[PDB]
């Protein structure tokens, strides 16, 4: 409540500029801030990645160990995603989205992580750790999680399943989160821009540009007109971010 | 197995046909507003506890009422008895469900107060999330809390490559996508989306076609919603002439 | 049919004047609640199929004194007579001595008390309570020695256990379980 | 504190009518309100029932699945009873009472729910979900719970145990809760009569009119004379109730 | 296997014999009142923290003191090392035990205060719940908290068709019934029932015949409680005459 | 034997008058606490084997200054000298500048500091305190700057750390850890 | 090198006067923060690498009105223009109608508003605020009828949707998002 | 806060006596209060002991039951220590220290507690239950814990393994906790003395006077010279306490 | 398996040699103070949130700031994915850590305030507790919060009978003793012990010698800390000259 005073004035500013068709830092309404992906940042981890989205920082680590195959899928691997935003409800929504995008795009062939039909199956733990929250930890974590899985090494030797091999990854889930303000949208909102409210839309695309997951959040009404425009711009934005994994 | 055989889903419904719905307002005596709703195998019950005082003073708001929404599944609502209490899924559904009404309720009329929505799924099938929202919107009107309009909700699935309205358990477990929607109905017409969520794989085109399929279903559901409140209107009406009679 | 659902368009904000159960947006009036639409004297209002009470200057309310200050008495207004629903503007109401028995009584203890359930009237935007009519007044009091329920004995309120007789503005409904 | 005002006044009313030996609604001191029992309200469940007691409403679901029994009793089925009164203290007591009636009356032959002696056994979950609390959710939940078990179908097939059959029920436990005010007792108290205080006595009887369980809850002293009297009444009310299971 | 062989029970007691009892008041130094009690193999200790200030202000009652009672079993008090932390059984025992005392403590004498009662069982056997209430009641007198009278409790069991006073573990685990009581004791006599609970299967007569077998043992227990406070009375008395000596 | 257990009948509500450690019900007097039954001039009371002290006019009390409102000092009374058991009527008491010192003192911050531990004597119901006498006063204070416990030096309190110096109604037991 | 780390000995408390970023102990001056050690006029201080602002006399502040008494205006001070780091001595300051615009306005409720973001100036201590300058005043007023934020139009704050207008001391940076 | 008034004064008193080289009861600074060790106070426990240190009283019970050894250390028995003080951050610390002393001194040979290679192993539960807190519940608890273990009977013939035997205890861990005040130390502080603050140093020693565990708790700076002296003093205090186990 | 072979440890360092250390201040934007730290294979990140208002009123100390310290291990920081959330070991570490700063931080200057220290270990090895302390201490200076001086921490272990500085994972697990230390440093000298703990088996003589090895190590680490802050001082300096440039 005492923090709100500074934020509210920051809100007036972001709106003062929105009326004049601009953002605080000069970006375009569909422009992400500089993205930096750094894999293998946690050696003891089977896979890992640090992603920087503007000043926003997040690190994802992956751990693999055998064990529990779900009763309904005793022949399908397992992927668990968790996040820590050092509230709970948010940290939970963040983990679920990242997970949905990985799950629905089938980025990781869960059938290949089988070891013993319904007895032992590889279990992939994806843990998201936020370091610096400067806005849109969601996209950063999504970029970091897929980047981490792509740079993951199955710990076969350490156990008894033979030679170690890279985790078979077949898709590249990416998500664009936009801050909706009235009938205007702002892709990749910064912490400052969020001072307007927590009204956002998140679209997740796969290799082929198929929408794999969508999530609208906040106490706001989403104009269907804007949603259509944002649906297009978003698939585009995800594609351009996807070529950041190429080089 | 096979989801669509000769234009008919595994229950006889067409790609654009809702499941049998039922709606009843004022079903709970101890509650400012309530509503029993059914959507296919889904049996849901919403309760609303009007603009009251939020007791733990810290969660109070000096300009508007806070809205709380609790989506809970009974341990006997699913196929395999589910341990009672908040699930991560439940927490999620409660967060988004509360966000759909936060935009609709005129919470600014009741500062420092709280309007709590409680929805309980006694029997679960696919779509309970949308059933509860429909059920809650009725209960909110029954409770008479000011709103910009109604909240109607439906999910659009996708089976065997074909978009379907109001998906059932099997089309939700074996389909290629599921997309719950909730719209604000104002003046008998879809105006905006209150709740949008999707999981699966759909093309940019299919998403747009799915919005359409859903708005058709919402108007259909909204009608059942006005009907249920109409009966209520009669009850409180012929109830006044009751004491006079 | 006068029936109306929340969201239904009532007309332009020009011709009609926003009233209870109605709101404006984009220059248009819609019902905020379900019920009968009444457009009388330029004013459009909707009779909610479940109104939310509002304590207003002139209403009979049920309250309980939370604290006394030798003059100004704080009474916790809980509900408006007529409607079972709890009002929206519930809160603390102040009852001054001048408005107690249109008589001459000092202090306050000789009429009010502590934790005692009261039944006064509303007069003043600040839930300013006033008790003048014989219908109003303490409806249920407790002794200070045994905290036991006090029974009404004629023109005074006596106690069964201890026997300490207490006096204070009694309400003809005192002990009736009604108000 | 703000709700206590209307409850105290309502209390003054209840006591006043009690003085003239009359209950708020005219009912007789040993008469339950309208009792309605509806089985199979929840389908996907192997057993279910809903009970209306006056304006009081309760639904009970019965679930079943093979499981491992208590190491103490290697040869016997398992029955767990829960309740959600959508505080926790009261919700545990209500579940335990209903529970005790079922267990002590031996309404369910736990020896018949054994699969692989010492390994698998039928675990019967009984969840009580209060829908409308208008007083005495207990008797309502006891009725509902027993009704629900009598209408239970063991899902033998679903688990490859073959051919479904009814859950053999051999007794009908029925509890009668009364509110105690001084020396007078009010059977099947309404939520409006409970404004007097949460002082009650509960007696559960079996098929043969024997006491299978008892429970007095609340901050009050029970007169022994009153008890003996009410002990008979309760056993009688049980019979008048236990007949609504016949027709 | 039989529980009653020739009038004698497995431990040699007669159907109407309390197990050996031991009661000592003022056993703890940092506590307003306290008591060490032993019923058969039950080893229990109670502590009372006299009229004190209840911290979370929302639990504070403006007219009367609030009573809290906590039954808790030591991880090492049962044959199978129990895991610390409130049990459903424990929560239940505490609630019913608190009620037994709310009915006697003169709470209207200390508004806004709290009288906390902690009772710990160091070694459990059947009826620990009974040992605790007895211990507690002694502790309360030791702490000097105004009461209508004393609280005495005992359980009646049923073994091989026969009622038995103060049942042991074996009887409780293989008998036909278990029924703990607690009475308010004014004027050296049993006045009313403070705590009543039954499990098993008993006839209308047996139940009534159980109260008699319970009040008989209670009076005996009560005399023991009274001797424990009388000794304490000597101790505070010769302790005063000590400072001057 | 004069020993009585709680619940023991002392006599009829007609015979004697209800005193300390005794309660009435059904027209009969009983003992509520264990102890020696004493009967002085028709008044039956019981001396508890564990008396719960009550702060009354004349008692020496120990307290903390929780609020310094101009010409007013709200003291957080917690113990009654002579008994270790927490007193039944604990709460906030009041100290007026007029009672700070039998002498002449302006302001209150000039004698009673915020958070200070005080030793005062009750001179009026509702925990009305008086620092008049020399045996009364502040027993421990903290430097307003460094918050270090101030050591007594002369008739003024001094901070050994920052050397600040404040003056106040110092009890002659300041720093002895005894009151 | 003027750089010092916390703990570095600066000199005896005899040779220098303890200044900001320095503490004394055993008659020795040490650095409490890391930064540049400066000794101006016998006064040794350290320029912190991350100063923690202290809202002193004469600096511009920013706050939200917590409650408007009839004459005194209670403001919740939060920041000190020129630094993002929340200052140390934050809390609630006081604004008296006498300090609004050098003009003569009676009520304070119409000068400032409840929950209005204000841009004041420090007068002396305990956060004594003033707003009689153009640069100072309200920065964001919320409508009392529709609860929405109001836009500026001339010298009035005209609500965009409800139309209601309010008049209160407005800052020249109103609605700018700057201060 | 209110209980603080009384404690702050008590604190002034103790500090007054320190300034005059005295402890409030007249003890020496390296002198423990009277110690009393009474084993077998809980017969339904494989082992147990009550310890009285001055007025401080503590009971420790020891329960043993077969279970699975940790994955990392098969061929190794298990010892789990837990404490109950009727805050938690203090209860955990007290248990961890007690536990640390037993474990680092190897008072019980865990290798001898193996039942089956890496499947069945004896699990030792040491639960500490504070009875009366008059200061230094830690040293008291360490005393009772090691005493209970010394009087432990492995319940072999209850799980059908073999014959019963006494738990082989190979060492005698004793911890000495001191209250550090300024530059002074007070061995075995009492609740009264503890009013000065919660700044202590604890040194646990073994049979050969080797330091087995150490722990300084509280917000304060421990002087190196004071520590060096407290070291020797503590080793010696432990030797004396250790003797109470002989006779 | 021998830990010391020819005066060298499995990684090649001598008994009195630190593992390679890397320290960087101001690495977080949304924190008042911070520092990244690498100690051997320990990757630790510290964040400090300058004197801010403590929210739960009951935790507000009228006379001084309150210190809170949270040591936490990322699920991926260990060999076997660790369940996120506090455990007994972390709560403990958090407590002694809180206490090490309670004596150095000048809390009396910020009444009713909170100085919250958060330390996360991204990759763990032996000594993480030590690494976090050094990180936290740098973070606190980066945040400019007043302190009597620096806090430098190192642990000493015992391997094959020899005391070794800054033990590694194999040494802590297979050695004979682990002893984490932390000192207060003023005027470039070890002044006092801020944190002390030990587990294992050491002779009185080895304990005193251990204090000596840790001091030699800590001074070396202190220098590295001073350096990280020196650079931070040079970067904010050339920053103030940047805006003017
Ligand atoms: Zn009375
Ligand atoms: Zn000072
Ligand atoms: Zn407006």
Q: Give the 3-state secondary structure of residue D221.
A: coil
- Pick left, alpha or beta for residue A21 (phi over 0 → left; psi -120 to 50 → alpha; otherwise beta): left
State the SS3 of F65-122. EEEEECCEEEEEEEEECCCCCCCCCCEEEEEEHHHHCCCCCCCCCCCCCCCCEEEEEE
| Beta strands I189-202 and I177-186, pairing class | antiparallel
State the SS3 of E60-73. CCCCCCEEEEEEEE
C-alpha distance from A224 to closest chain G C-alpha (Å) = 23
Task: Name B220's Cβ contacts closer than 8 Å, sequence gap at least 6.
Answer: B18
Q: Among positive and negative, which fits the CA dihedral H22, H27, H28, H33? A: negative
Nearest to C7 by CA among B188, B224, B218: B188
Evaluate whether G140 touches G166 at the Cβ level (below 8 Å).
no
Task: Name E118's Cβ contacts closer than 8 Å, sequence gap at least 6.
Answer: E46, E47, E48, E49, E69, E70, E72, H86
∠B220-B188-G146 over CA atoms, to 5°? 130
Nearest to C130 by CA among C116, C111, C114: C111
The verdict on residue E97 lying in a domain is yes
C-alpha distance from C176 to closest chain F C-alpha (Å) = 26
∠B3-B9-B10 over CA atoms, to 5°? 75
The stretches of chain I forming alpha helices (DSSP H) are 88-102, 128-142, 169-174, 204-243
Evaluate whether D187 touches D196 at the Cβ level (below 8 Å).
no
The verdict on residue E8 lying in a domain is no
Nearest to E35 by CA among E48, E21, E52: E48
**To which residue do tokens 């409006």 refer?**
D192
- C-alpha distances (whole Å) from A62 to each of A36, D113, G127, H136 are 19, 44, 52, 45
Q: Which token pair is I230?
A: 């020196």
Number of domains in chain A: 1
Q: What count of Cα atoms within 13 Å lies in the side-chain half-sphere of residue C133?
A: 11
Task: Look at E64 and C142 and tell me if their CB atoms are within 8 Å.
Answer: no
The verdict on residue I8 lying in a domain is no
- Pick left, alpha or beta for residue G6 (phi over 0 → left; psi -120 to 50 → alpha; otherwise beta): beta
The verdict on residue H95 lying in a domain is yes
Q: How far is the CA of C165 from the centre of ligand 1 (A)?
A: 7
The verdict on residue B6 lying in a domain is no
Q: Which token pair is I11?
A: 């990684």
- C162 labelled ligand-binding: yes
Measure the CA–CA gap between F123 and F57, rounded to whole angstroms: 5
| Beta strands D120-132 and D78-84, pairing class | parallel
Q: Which residues from chain I sit within 8 angstroms of residue A44, using beta carbons?
A: 41, 76-79, 123-124
Nearest to H42 by CA among D181, C21, E81: E81
Among the bound ligands, name the one nearest to the CA of residue F24. Answer: 1
Sequence-ordered strand ranges (E) for chain C: 3-4, 9-12, 17-18, 22-25, 28-31, 35-40, 43-48, 60-69, 72-80, 91-95, 117-122, 129-130, 151-153, 156-158
Evaluate whether A220 touches A184 at the Cβ level (below 8 Å).
no
Cβ atoms < 10 Å from Cβ of A1: 12
Q: Among positive and negative, which fits the CA dihedral D10, D14, D15, D16? A: positive
The verdict on residue E77 lying in a domain is yes
Q: Give the structural domain span for I147.
A: 16-245
Measure the CA–CA gap between C127 and C75, rounded to whole angstroms: 9
Measure the CA–CA gap between H235 and H58, rounded to whole angstroms: 23
- Pick left, alpha or beta for residue D181 (phi over 0 → left; psi -120 to 50 → alpha; otherwise beta): beta
Evaluate whether G129 touches G123 at the Cβ level (below 8 Å).
yes
Evaluate whether E41 touches H44 at the Cβ level (below 8 Å).
yes
Q: Which token pair is H157?
A: 């013939």
Q: Which token pair is E238?
A: 């010769």
Check CB contact of C170 with chain D, cutoff 8 Å.
no
Sequence-ordered strand ranges (E) for chain E: 4-5, 8-9, 21-25, 33-39, 42-53, 66-73, 113-123, 150-159, 162-165, 177-186, 189-202
Task: Name A138's Cβ contacts closer than 8 Å, sequence gap at least 6.
Answer: A94, A97, A98, A175, A177, A202
Q: Which token pair is G159?
A: 């609500």
Evaluate whether C45 touches C2 at the Cβ level (below 8 Å).
no
The verdict on residue A190 lying in a domain is yes
Number of domains in chain I: 1
Q: How far is the CA of F149 from the centre of ligand 2 (A)?
A: 8
Q: How far is the CA of B215 from the centre of ligand 3 (A)?
A: 34
Measure the CA–CA gap between A152 and E242, rounded to whole angstroms: 79
Task: Look at F177 and H1 and tell me if their CB atoms are within 8 Å.
Answer: no
**Optimal mutation site among G141, G144, G147, interface B, most CBs of chain B within 10 A:** G147
Evaluate whether I88 touches H94 at the Cβ level (below 8 Å).
no
Evaluate whether E18 touches E154 at the Cβ level (below 8 Å).
yes
Burial class (CB in 10 A: 0-12, 13-18, 19+), I83: exposed
Q: Which residues pair with A26 in a beta bridge?
A: none
State the SS3 of A188-222. CCCCCHHHHCCCEEEEEECCCCCEEEEEEECCCCE
The verdict on residue D1 lying in a domain is no
Measure the CA–CA gap between H43 and H33, rounded to whole angstroms: 28
Structural domains in chain C, CATH included, are 1-52 (2.40.50.100), 53-138 (2.40.50.140), 139-172 (2.20.70.10)
The verdict on residue A2 lying in a domain is no
Cβ atoms < 10 Å from Cβ of H227: 22
Measure the CA–CA gap between B197 and B210, rounded to whole angstroms: 12
C-alpha distance from A128 to closest chain B C-alpha (Å) = 16
| Beta strands B66-73 and B113-123, pairing class | parallel
Measure the CA–CA gap between C6 and B148, rounded to whole angstroms: 7
Nearest to A121 by CA among A158, A168, A71: A71
The verdict on residue H2 lying in a domain is no
Evaluate whether G100 touches G123 at the Cβ level (below 8 Å).
no
Q: Which token pair is F53?
A: 């002290």
Q: Give the 3-state secondary structure of residue D156.
A: coil
The verdict on residue H106 lying in a domain is yes
With residues binned 3-state (H G I as helix, E B as strand, rest as coil), the percentages for chain D, rounded to 5, are: 30, 30, 35
| Beta strands C72-80 and A35-39, pairing class | unpaired
CA-based R_g, chain D, Å? 19
Nearest to D205 by CA among D168, D244, D166, D241: D241
Evaluate whether C63 touches C120 at the Cβ level (below 8 Å).
yes
The strand order across the sheet containing G9-12 reads: G9-12, G28-31, G22-25
Measure the CA–CA gap between C60 and C41, rounded to whole angstroms: 29
- G178 labelled ligand-binding: no
Evaluate whether A201 touches A225 at the Cβ level (below 8 Å).
no
The verdict on residue I58 lying in a domain is yes
∠C51-C54-C58 over CA atoms, to 5°? 125
Q: Among positive and negative, which fits the CA dihedral G38, G41, G44, G50? A: negative
Q: Give the structural domain span for A221.
A: 7-247
Q: What is the DSSP letter of F160?
A: T
Given resolution (angstroms)? 2.7
Backbone φ and ψ for I204, nearest 5 degrees, come out as -50, -40
Cβ atoms < 10 Å from Cβ of D157: 10
Residues in chain D: 247
Residues in chain E: 245
CATH, residue A90? 3.30.230.70
Task: Name D87's Cβ contacts closer than 8 Å, sequence gap at least 6.
Answer: none
**To which residue do tokens 């400072």 refer?**
E243
- List, as ranges, residues 59-78 from I with C-beta within 8 Å of F: 62-64
Measure the CA–CA gap between B184 and A221, rounded to whole angstroms: 8
Measure the CA–CA gap between G60 and G139, rounded to whole angstroms: 13
> b or e along A152-179 (b: 16 or more beta carbons within 10 Å of the residue's beta carbon)?
bbbbbeeeeeeeeeebebebbbbbbbbb
CATH, residue E128? 3.30.230.70
Burial class (CB in 10 A: 0-12, 13-18, 19+), B100: buried
Task: Name I159's Cβ contacts closer than 8 Å, sequence gap at least 6.
Answer: I3, I4, I9, I167, I171, I174, I175, I176
> DSSP readout, E7-37?
TEETTS-BTT-PPPEEEEE---SSSSEEEEE
Q: For chain B, which residues lie within 8 Å of any Cβ of chain D, measuring from their own Cβ?
A: 28-31, 41, 43, 45, 53, 72, 74-81, 84, 118, 120, 122-124
The verdict on residue I64 lying in a domain is yes
- C-alpha distances (whole Å) from A21 to each of A26, A33, A178, A185, E17 are 10, 18, 16, 11, 91
Task: Look at C147 and E108 and tell me if their CB atoms are within 8 Å.
Answer: yes
Measure the CA–CA gap between I102 and A171, rounded to whole angstroms: 51
Evaluate whether G116 touches G168 at the Cβ level (below 8 Å).
yes
Nearest to E50 by CA among E180, E142, E174: E142
Evaluate whether G149 touches G142 at the Cβ level (below 8 Å).
yes
Q: Of all helices (H) and strands (E), which one includes residue G9?
A: strand G9-12
Measure the CA–CA gap between B29 and A20, rounded to whole angstroms: 54
Evaluate whether F67 touches F40 at the Cβ level (below 8 Å).
no
> Which chains lie within 8 Å of chain E at 3 or more CB pairs, if any?
C, D, F, H
Nearest to D174 by CA among D83, D88, D86, D51: D51
Evaluate whether B44 touches B131 at the Cβ level (below 8 Å).
yes
Task: Look at C49 and B236 and tell me if their CB atoms are within 8 Å.
Answer: yes
Measure the CA–CA gap between H147 and H40, rounded to whole angstroms: 10
User: Which residue in chain E is spatially nearest to F3 when comparing CA positions?
Assistant: E230
Task: Look at C78 and D2 and tell me if their CB atoms are within 8 Å.
Answer: yes
**To which residue do tokens 């400067």 refer?**
A134
Q: How far is the CA of D19 from the centre of ligand 1 (A)?
A: 20
C-alpha distance from I191 to closest chain H C-alpha (Å) = 8
The verdict on residue B4 lying in a domain is no
């Amino acid at each position: 409540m005492p923090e709100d005073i500074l934020v509210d004035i920051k809100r007036d500013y972001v709106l003062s500029k929105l009326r004049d068709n601009e953002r605080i830092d000069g970006r375009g309404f569909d422009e992400f801030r500089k993205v930096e992906i750094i894999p293998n940042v946690i050696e003891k981890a089977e896979g890992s990645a640090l992603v920087k989205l503007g000043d926003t920082q997040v690190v994802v680590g992956v751990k693999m160990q055998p064990g529990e195959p779900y009763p309904d899928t005793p022949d399908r691997g397992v992927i668990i995603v968790n996040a820590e935003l050092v509230p709970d409800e948010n940290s939970i929504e963040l983990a679920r989205v990242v997970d949905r995008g990985i799950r629905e795009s089938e980025a990781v062939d869960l059938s290949k992580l089988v070891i013993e039909e319904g007895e032992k199956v590889w279990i992939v733990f994806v843990d998201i750790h936020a370091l610096d929250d400067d806005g849109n930890l969601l996209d950063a974590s999504a970029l970091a999680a897929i980047a981490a899985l792509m740079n993951t090494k199955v710990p076969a030797e350490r156990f008894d399943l033979g030679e170690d091999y890279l985790l078979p990854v077949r898709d590249l889930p990416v998500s664009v989160t936009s801050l909706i303000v009235g009938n205007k949208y702002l892709v990749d909102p910064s912490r400052e821009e969020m001072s307007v409210g927590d009204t956002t839309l998140t679209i997740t695309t796969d290799k082929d540009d198929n929408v794999v997951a969508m999530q609208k959040s906040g106490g706001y009404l989403l104009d269907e007109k804007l949603f259509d425009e944002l649906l297009d711009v978003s698939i585009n934005c995800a594609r351009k971010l996807r070529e950041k994994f190429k080089e | 197995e096979k989801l669509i055989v000769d234009g008919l889903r595994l229950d006889g419904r067409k790609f654009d046909e809702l499941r049998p719905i039922k709606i009843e307002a004022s079903v709970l005596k101890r509650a400012d507003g309530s509503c029993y709703l059914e959507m296919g195998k889904n049996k849901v019950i919403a309760a609303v506890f009007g603009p009251r005082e939020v007791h733990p003073r810290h969660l109070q708001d000096p300009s508007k009422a806070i809205i709380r929404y609790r989506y809970n599944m009974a341990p006997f609502s699913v196929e395999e008895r589910k341990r009672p209490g908040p699930d991560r899924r439940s927490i999620e559904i409660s967060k988004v469900s509360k966000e759909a009404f936060e935009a609709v309720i005129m919470k600014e009329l009741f500062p420092r107060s709280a309007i709590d929505i409680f929805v309980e799924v006694l029997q679960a099938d696919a779509g309970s999330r949308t059933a509860c929202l429909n059920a809650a919107s009725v209960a909110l009107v029954d409770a008479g809390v000011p709103m910009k309009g109604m909240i109607t909700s439906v999910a659009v699935g996708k089976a065997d490559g074909q978009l379907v309205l109001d998906p059932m358990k099997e089309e939700d477990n074996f389909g290629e996508a599921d997309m719950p929607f909730a719209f604000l109905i104002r003046n008998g017409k879809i105006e905006s989306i209150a709740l949008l969520q999707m999981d699966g794989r759909m093309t940019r085109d299919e998403v747009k076609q799915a919005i359409e399929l859903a708005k058709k279903g919402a108007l259909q559901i909204y009608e059942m919603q006005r009907e249920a409140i109409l009966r209520r209107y009669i009850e409180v009406g012929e109830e006044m002439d009751e004491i006079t009679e | 049919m006068r029936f109306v659902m929340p969201g239904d368009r009532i007309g332009s904000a020009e011709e009609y004047v926003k009233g209870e159960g109605v709101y404006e947006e984009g220059g248009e009036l819609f019902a905020a609640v379900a019920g009968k639409l009444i457009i009388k004297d330029r004013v459009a209002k909707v009779e909610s199929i479940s109104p939310i009470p509002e304590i207003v200057k002139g209403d009979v309310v049920l309250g309980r004194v939370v604290d006394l200050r030798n003059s100004i008495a704080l009474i916790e207004v809980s509900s408006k007579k007529g409607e079972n629903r709890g009002p929206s503007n519930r809160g603390i109401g102040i009852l001054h001595v001048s408005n107690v028995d249109e008589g001459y009584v000092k202090e306050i203890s000789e009429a009010v008390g502590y934790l005692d359930i009261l039944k006064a009237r509303v007069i003043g935007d600040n839930l300013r309570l006033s008790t003048k009519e014989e219908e109003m007044g303490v409806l249920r009091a407790l002794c200070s020695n045994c905290k036991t329920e006090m029974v009404r004995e004629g023109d005074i309120l006596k106690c069964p256990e201890c026997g300490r007789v207490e006096k204070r503005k009694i309400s003809t409904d005192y002990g009736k379980g009604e108000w």
